[PDB]
Write a protein that binds this ligand. Structure first.
Ligand code: 8VH
Ligand code: 8VH
Ligand code: 8VH
Ligand code: 8VH
Ligand code: 8VH
Ligand code: 8VH
Ligand code: 8VH
Ligand code: 8VH
Ligand code: 8VH
Ligand code: 8VH
Ligand code: 8VH
Ligand code: 8VH
Ligand code: 8VH
Ligand code: 8VH
Ligand code: 8VH
Lengths: 21, 7, 21, 21, 21, 21, 7, 7, 7, 7, 21, 21, 21, 21, 21, 7, 7, 7, 7, 7, 21, 21, 21, 21, 21, 7, 7, 7, 7, 7
């Protein structure tokens, strides 16, 4: 993942389970 | 704009 | 994933399960 | 992951389970 | 991971379990 | 991990369990 | 604009 | 814009 | 913008 | 913007 | 792979060569 | 692969070569 | 791999060559 | 790998060559 | 690897060569 | 119900 | 229900 | 239900 | 239900 | 249910 | 990709961006 | 990738960005 | 990658960025 | 990577950035 | 990496940055 | 038979 | 048969 | 058959 | 068959 | 067949 812009303007929950990048 | 998670 | 612009303007939940990128 | 911009403007929870990057 | 910009503007919890980077 | 910029602007908890970097 | 998740 | 997690 | 975690 | 963790 | 149920009821040989999961 | 039920009732040989799952 | 149930009921040989999980 | 249940009910040989988990 | 249950009910040989976990 | 493999 | 492998 | 491997 | 390996 | 390894 | 025979007989530039093979 | 034969007979530049093989 | 034969017969530059093999 | 044969017959530059093999 | 044969027949520069093998 | 790349 | 790259 | 790289 | 790299 | 690197 490149140049990701994560700006929800609120609450943010990121649950990532065993990524292979 | 809150987040609530329950399992 | 490139140049992603995640701006929901509220609550954000991202659940990603075993991605292969 | 490169050039990630995580600015939720609120509460942030990141749960990452066994990533392989 | 390179050039990560983690600025939630609030509370931040990062739980990373056995990463291989 | 290189050039990480962790500035939550609040409380910060980092729990990292057996990383291999 | 809140989010609620229940399993 | 708070976050609440319950398992 | 607080965070609360409960297991 | 505080953090509370409970197990 | 999740919830795999390998019960051949006999001899079992599994040869997996460079999986990326 | 999810919820796989491998029960041949005999001899079983699985040869998987460079899967990307 | 999660929740794998390997019960061949006989002889079992698992040869895994350079997995990335 | 999580929650693996290896019960062949016989002889078991596991040969794993340079895993990255 | 977590919660592994290795109970072959017989002879067990585990040969692991340069794992990175 | 046996299996035989030859290369 | 045996298995035989030959290369 | 035995296993035989030959290279 | 035995295992035999030969290289 | 024995194991025999030969190289 | 298998049995690829890349013989341009000149200059060769290969730019491959995030392949999943 | 298997049995690749890269013989350009000249200059060779290979730029591969985050492959998953 | 297996059995790769890189013989450009000239100058060779290989730039590989975060491969997962 | 196995059985790699890197013989450019000239100048060779290999730049590999955070591989996971 | 196994059985690598690096014979450029000239100048060789290998720059490897945080490999995980 | 040369190659020239410009961005 | 040369290669030239410019960004 | 040379290689030239410029960023 | 030389190599030149410039950043 | 020389190598020159400049940053
Ligand atoms: C885009 C992305 C999110 C989480 C983990 C990875 C490896 C990549
Ligand atoms: C686009 C994307 C989201 C999450 C994970 C990956 C690897 C990619
Ligand atoms: C994008 C990313 C998130 C968490 C862990 C990794 C290795 C990568
Ligand atoms: C992006 C990243 C987050 C946590 C751990 C690693 C190794 C990488
Ligand atoms: C990015 C990172 C976070 C924690 C530990 C490591 C080795 C790397
Ligand atoms: C389903 C599966 C079998 C063997 C290896 C992996 C990574 C996955
Ligand atoms: C279904 C399946 C079999 C073997 C390997 C994978 C990754 C998946
Ligand atoms: C499912 C699986 C089998 C062997 C190795 C891994 C990493 C995963
Ligand atoms: C599932 C598994 C088997 C052997 C080694 C690893 C790292 C994982
Ligand atoms: C699952 C596993 C088996 C052997 C070694 C490691 C590091 C992990
Ligand atoms: C055919 C091929 C070219 C480049 C990368 C991959 C994974 C495959
Ligand atoms: C065919 C190939 C080229 C570069 C990288 C990979 C993983 C595969
Ligand atoms: C084919 C290949 C080239 C570079 C790196 C890897 C892991 C594989
Ligand atoms: C094929 C390869 C090149 C460089 C590094 C690795 C781990 C693999
Ligand atoms: C193939 C390879 C090159 C450099 C470092 C490692 C760990 C592997």
């Amino acid at each position: 993942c490149d140049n990701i812009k994560h700006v929800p303007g609120g609450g943010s929950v990121q649950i990532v389970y065993k990524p292979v990048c | 704009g809150s987040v609530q998670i329950v399992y």
